[PDB]
Ligand binder design. Structure first.
Ligand code: CL
Ligand code: CL
Ligand code: CL
Length: 320
């Protein structure tokens, strides 16, 4: 049985904003579901000071029980909260932080990085500490790593996480802190540039899944023409796919690309590359994401595969 133990990692982002995590378990530990007991300690030994936010996956949410002093947010590892849930979090934090100058918010997630960073950086924007998502993200990265070099990827883990902090910035600045109006869209096309070196280099290994919040709503398989029609353009080093039968989409959308190619590595989320967007913040008839704006190609270790001009564009139709 060698070594067990409780390793509570606590990082003061500001004097009243804490990021907490438990980096050490491990495997079979006596300390199962530590949040309940950390909460119990706070309400006993430091009453009416700390409010804990527990950020956990769909599966991990089931293991939790309601707590008066704990606010739960459902977010999958290497993913983002719904924009609605992000705004609800900000509202709850605002109420807690403003009611008493001594009040502290403590944000917890398993890895103490991507999910925590998304919410902490959004909070820093709400409290006016920074004017831009980039500044907030870099600052949190610097606090959690104790390292000076400003890197947004030290603050969060994925490009969608960076996007969602940006979404909050836009909501605060341009929408009066309110959720933007619903926008209904259908995906009618996908275009991928710099396809050479990516799987088979011609799109024939690829499939695309569209997920609405947590439910698959469309699957396209490119080579086969399953809900689609693939065209490979060698002269422009790109693939374009007509997307067929897309249902009406609204709100938070996840797009995942899968491959039958052994040579194309999976990153996070059990796939080669993926991204999140919100339909309400789509401008025009498309969204185009560059290499470092896509989840997985954002990592330098994949740059021999996803080259400088690798981009993914979704083309939309207006659904009333
Ligand atoms: Cl419950
Ligand atoms: Cl792999
Ligand atoms: Cl239509």
């Amino acid at each position: 049985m060698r070594k067990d133990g409780f390793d509570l990692d606590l990082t003061y982002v500001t004097d009243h904003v804490i990021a907490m995590s438990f980096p050490s378990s491990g495997r079979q530990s006596l300390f199962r579901n530590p949040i309940g007991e950390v909460s119990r300690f706070f309400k006993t030994k430091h009453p009416d000071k700390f409010r804990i936010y527990n950020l956990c996956s769909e599966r991990g949410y089931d293991e939790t029980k309601f707590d008066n002093h704990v606010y739960r947010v459902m977010i999958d590892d290497h993913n983002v909260p719904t924009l609605v849930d992000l705004l609800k979090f900000i509202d709850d934090a605002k109420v807690w932080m403003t009611s008493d100058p001594d009040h502290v918010i403590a944000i917890h997630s398993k890895g103490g990085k991507g999910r925590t960073g998304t919410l902490v950086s959004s909070w820093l924007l709400e409290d006016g500490k920074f004017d831009t998502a980039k500044e907030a993200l870099e600052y949190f990265g610097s606090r959690r790593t104790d390292f000076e070099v400003g890197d947004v990827f030290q603050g969060v883990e994925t490009a969608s996480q960076i996007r969602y902090v940006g979404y909050f910035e836009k909501i605060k600045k341009n929408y009066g802190g309110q959720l933007p109006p619903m926008k209904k869209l259908k995906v009618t096309g996908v275009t991928i540039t710099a396809i050479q070196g990516v799987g088979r280099g011609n799109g024939s290994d690829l499939s695309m899944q569209i997920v609405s919040e947590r439910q698959e709503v469309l699957l396209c398989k490119f080579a086969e023409g399953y809900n689609c029609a693939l065209q490979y353009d060698a002269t422009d080093d790109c693939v374009t796919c007509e997307v067929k039968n897309c249902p009406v989409l609204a709100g938070d959308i996840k797009v995942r690309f899968m491959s039958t190619s052994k040579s194309l590595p999976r990153g996070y989320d059990n796939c080669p590359f993926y991204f999140w967007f919100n339909t309400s913040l789509v401008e025009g008839d498309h969204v185009t994401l560059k290499r470092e704006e896509i989840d997985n190609p954002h990592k330098k270790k994949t740059w021999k595969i996803y080259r400088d001009n690798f981009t993914v564009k979704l083309t939309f139709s207006d659904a009333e």
